[PDB]
Symmetry: D2
Subunit: 258 residues, 4 copies
């Protein structure tokens, strides 16, 4: 099956930033034809720790910006919603509606996404056990979703630290397609993220076996308005993708059947 790579800048800092990243993603999509790319960026960071941190430029602006990417590059789009009313307007441009990790159990949000007819990707709550995502998929299927994704993004391990229990990939694979979040799984919740572990954990994810990877990328991570410690420099994206396809290929014959 075609491997999914969901990538893009964490936040929609500007339509310019999006075009620059989309251009590179478009180029890579032409090179890695066996990969299905999906451009990602949030119109709002509705859960920042601090009230003084960057949130965004509003839903209206973001959807317009994302639509420009899809139009100019012909790329699939995904972004996250935070309250039920946002699903409808977002569904106009988003091919995949993303459900934030903290909100993975909010019934109305999941139902709002499911009825749009779009694909839904739920980030696994840092508080949720692998086997507890079964009910999450049941809610989505009940709400009309026909294409569902579950994203591994780490689990609460003591304070201000997350650990990735890779046993979760085959467990979740039982009821949904699984995506590995390479950049948020190494972040330190309220710490201020460890970038040196992004690549190795990604290798692990593909050797274990998943249906795709989620990576936040920015031309200059050091200048990002969000996740400046975890976003991957855009120049490194090509090499990372090439590496996971290679590892995925050689490990593929050993993937267990669910």
């Amino acid at each position: 099956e075609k491997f999914l790579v969901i990538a893009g800048p964490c936040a929609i800092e500007s339509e310019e930033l999006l075009l620059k990243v989309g251009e590179e993603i478009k180029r890579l999509s032409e090179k890695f034809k066996e990969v299905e790319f999906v451009f990602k960026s949030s119109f709002d960071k509705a859960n920042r720790s601090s009230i003084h941190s960057f949130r965004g430029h509003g839903l209206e602006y973001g959807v317009k910006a994302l639509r420009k990417v899809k139009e100019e590059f012909g790329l699939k789009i995904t972004t996250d919603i935070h309250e039920s009313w946002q699903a409808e307007p977002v569904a106009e441009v988003a091919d995949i509606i993303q459900i934030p990790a903290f909100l993975c159990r909010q019934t109305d949000l999941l139902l709002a996404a499911a009825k749009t007819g779009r694909a839904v990707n739920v980030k696994k709550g840092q508080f949720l056990a692998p086997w507890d995502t079964k009910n999450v998929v049941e809610k989505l299927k009940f709400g009309g979703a026909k294409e569902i994704y579950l994203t591994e993004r780490g689990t609460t391990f003591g304070y201000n630290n997350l650990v990735v229990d890779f046993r979760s990939l085959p467990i979740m694979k039982q009821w949904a397609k699984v995506i590995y979040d390479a950049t948020h799984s190494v972040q330190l919740p309220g710490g201020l993220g460890m970038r040196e572990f992004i690549f190795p954990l990604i290798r692990a994810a593909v050797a274990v076996g998943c249906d795709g990877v989620f990576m936040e990328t920015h031309p200059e991570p050091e200048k990002a308005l969000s996740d400046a410690s975890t976003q991957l420099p855009l120049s490194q994206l090509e090499g990372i993708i090439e590496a996971i396809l290679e590892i995925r290929e050689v490990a593929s014959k050993y993937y267990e059947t669910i």
Copy 2:
């Protein structure tokens, strides 16, 4: 004075609320050294299963809660799940409760603070004690003045929560601290640990306790494995007041 927030988990019917309201009203008359707050949810917006009881809706709920406040003169508190609910709920709720999973949702916190009512934030199972300083800052920025932080356990492996009582003194630096005696022992819950841990909460030091109670916990449509039997409420309250009276002499300053 010491705060005691109690009531049934979900508004199963205004009937149920009135019955519990009666008992809470009685205790209220018996323990003048305690500020009682009637609590109940108009919607269980985060059940694990789509096939579980959620409730009768916001209007039926705000209605029944109005009936309790008017028939017993008790303060009220219930939780909101989306920004638009803050305003209508603030009509009856003296304290607006923010769900644990939603403690980082900026707009929800701001919407709550905007109503001018008191705000109680359940500490997320993913949050470290010191991470709550930022939750309070948001509320203050939003105009909130009476702010509460509730301890309800922290993620400890899978399907288990642990109470790190170091959290009470830490959170107290920036807000009044409430201990959730019923949800802190639930397994994402042995009722046998409810009383022992509430005793610890008061020996350590907190500004109030949160307890879900029901005439017949087993028949409850929600948290049936942890809701405290109504008849046991008085006994526990008297016990925590006695322990608090003695232990308060040693509560550390700030």
Copy 3:
């Protein structure tokens, strides 16, 4: 039942240090007649993180030092063993033989302690669940122990941090007398301990209900050769003990029956 207070300097820095602490413990034992005191100190810190840290002056020296305390003050004695051969010689002076937390599952060490006829106190491993101590008691009873204690000293919570799950006290009470370690439960494993939490957690322990408390105390913690961040200043011991007896008394009528 008579409340147990196990206290003393972490390590046997010198026989002088022991006499100074024992003198104060002896004085307190005369004041708090409803308490059963047991003087504690280790002749060896066999599990320090660093090879350059203080271990002790040997078994021979320590046993002699402890015997001096028991002789000069008439106090019960307890110290920990690290290998089977030490039980016999230690049993000569120790009323209670202590089993280190990391060694709570070493069968021969437990059996070695049990056959001396002395009381045995096992520090609960930071890796052990409350209900798993049942087998630990079974091993001791099998080995001849007739007076067994289980000590709560925290559980691994992420890296370099321990949390105390107070549900463990009533659980362990089902098969042994339970002791709460007030000073090691707030230490940060390999961190360099948070002294400001010692007192509040002790209040919690007695309000929940336990059969005794374990506290390391030193005249000048800042100068200790071990646990300088967790040892309680000897001047504060009297007040702490008075406080727990008061809290224990008022909470006592509510202790659940096992």
Copy 4:
């Protein structure tokens, strides 16, 4: 070259060791790019229950291990539990293994290093990756030169272990890192996760893998729920070599 440490959990009989030794000897001939080490414990000194199988003693064990090294010319490794055992065990064991619970016992580490043999320390379930730097220092101080640190999971709530693969690159700064594929999935263990995680171990990067194997894992007197079936060993080895060959191009330096 890549290290593969394998054998039955406990020395149930020199008979069992010889059978497994035969298969390991065969793989040894088939995979020259791999250094195989035969492993088995003469004593299970830390069983939870007093009524569980421990073994046949140190002499019967060191004897049977001698038979394997002499009949197949394989390197040997077994674990010690008290200082006095280092010397007699060093007679046959090429690598002395230090139990996870005992990774902080200074005298045991020193006793092992004193023999002059290689030393493999199982990382305690209570230890953080960076805390192993001190474990190595002790060994070096004791005269050890060939030092190994084995990843075997970390305490995650109760009765569960999680593998934080960030530990492999961290521990590599001061020692050769081995991944314990069988004990890392055991619940203080679904065999279904053994292969997937070993694949991750090699994709991430390690110097060898540790695997307990038995002709009939179910009949094993120890770790019966996690011991890998002897027949599946070859397949897994070939798989990790292939993955390693491809992934090694991306292993980070130091």
